[PDB]
Amino acid sequence: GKLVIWINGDKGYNGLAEVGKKFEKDTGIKVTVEHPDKLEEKFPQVAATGDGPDIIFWAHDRFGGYAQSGLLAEITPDKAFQDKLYPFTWDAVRYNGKLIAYPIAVEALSLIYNKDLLPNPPKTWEEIPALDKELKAKGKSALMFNLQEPYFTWPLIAADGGYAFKYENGKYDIKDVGVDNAGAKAGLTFLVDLIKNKHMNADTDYSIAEAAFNKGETAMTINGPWAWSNIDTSKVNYGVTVLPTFKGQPSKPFVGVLSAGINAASPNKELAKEFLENYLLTDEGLEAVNKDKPLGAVALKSYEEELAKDPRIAATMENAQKGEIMPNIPQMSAFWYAVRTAVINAASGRQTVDEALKDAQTGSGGTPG
């Protein structure tokens, strides 16, 4: 009769702990909230039977591997509970058509812009070149974001058809990769052309983009809710909105879903289920943790509508809904390496778009075609 919980140190574990406080005050179940570093890398080592936390909180992508080796219990929320969450969020916690965790929060990149420099941000990528020339004449830059990680450039590359692994009703076809198709090539070529024409620089990284935007040097950047606090400190008059479209199609950023999984070796699974569905996944539950540390957009429709009053959170949710859920399969690890290399080589002219993506396609475990 004891529930142990593992959650990252950047989350609101104080608020979550406050949640287990009520559970313990209604059932007498001692709830413990810990946040050891490397917990995700440690869980599969400690949870491999013997003993580990009962409930682990982490981005859903890492849960695929856990389920692969049978480390997570299959949860079974009822049709009523399932309706309290946005449908797309259940798709992020599925492994082989089996629910393996509960959706908590949702994150995705958004377009961030300096309202003083740019009243109405561009609704399309195609408009950016013209916008940059207009701004360069006033000593300003149109757009500046981290071009070193495929996580940041994927939204554009995926827009016209690119995708990581094909997702079909609860499962991924691990051999059907979408980095080599006409859509991916169209997106990457548009990105390379921005570099080729000097609208962006291939060496721009996370720190450079961040500093440039917070110093009012660039009109826009692309980043997630984690960067918001620093922008508030810079006092830049900023807005957060939908990402621009490419060829009339929405940019598809990767969606990350903070989730809570149950240890398959946990002796008290009923308790864990009770805690999550009736104490945490509630308007008061989430609000308790959100107060200690903002969660961003939320999977629970109920609390999301309340949080969505903040236009930044509404943008986050709108971009996520148009995005691509990050595949939770083991293959993603090679995907990240392969694609990072392709964009960097394409951006510096070391490889052509075709060449670069052909290598990324096979490096990700897909077939050329």
Binding site: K133, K196, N197, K198, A202, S348, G349, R350
Partner: protein, 157 residues
């Protein structure tokens, strides 16, 4: 080297005086970085006429091409810097240089409907019939970008 990067940066930022000091300290006018971008590319792109003149005077290669096949002239036409386009042409710039995709400076000026740059280019012998990788000419580029005006003019094929 040391002065190499400095010169590129100064040329990009239009620091005319910094360029003066750097040249005096032995900086290579034809210093090219990772992507083959020379100080002349950066000054031609940023629109710094005085710096373009200085680099050319010191022997800057007027037709250096970067990894994408761009010469300083490509960047000057695309960015609408007419003065710099003229200076480059007078210093021997190849009016028909082609990038990796087969685009010439005329194609780039066409994308924006830069009439004056188009004229200076034609006068210097720009091949209006030149086709790029997508089998497109300057004319085809004008329609794709909706430059009806320039389009009607390039009608002299």
């Amino acid at each position: 080297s040391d002065l190499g990067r400095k010169l590129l940066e100064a040329a990009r930022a239009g620091q005319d005086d910094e360029v003066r000091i750097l040249m005096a300290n032995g900086a290579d006018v034809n210093a090219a970085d990772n992507t083959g971008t020379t100080p002349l590319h950066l000054a031609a792109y940023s629109g710094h006429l005085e710096i373009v003149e200085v680099l050319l005077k010191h022997g800057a290669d007027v037709d250096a091409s970067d990894v994408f096949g761009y010469t300083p002239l490509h960047l000057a036409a695309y960015w609408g810097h007419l003065e710099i386009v003229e200076v480059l042409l007078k210093n021997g710039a190849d009016v028909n240089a082609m990038d990796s995709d087969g685009m010439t400076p005329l194609h780039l000026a066409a994308k924006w409907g830069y009439l004056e740059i188009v004229e200076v280019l034609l006068k210097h012998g720009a091949d209006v019939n030149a086709q790029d990788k997508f089998g497109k000419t300057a004319f085809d580029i004008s329609i794709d970008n909706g430059n009806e005006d320039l389009a009607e003019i390039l009608q002299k094929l």
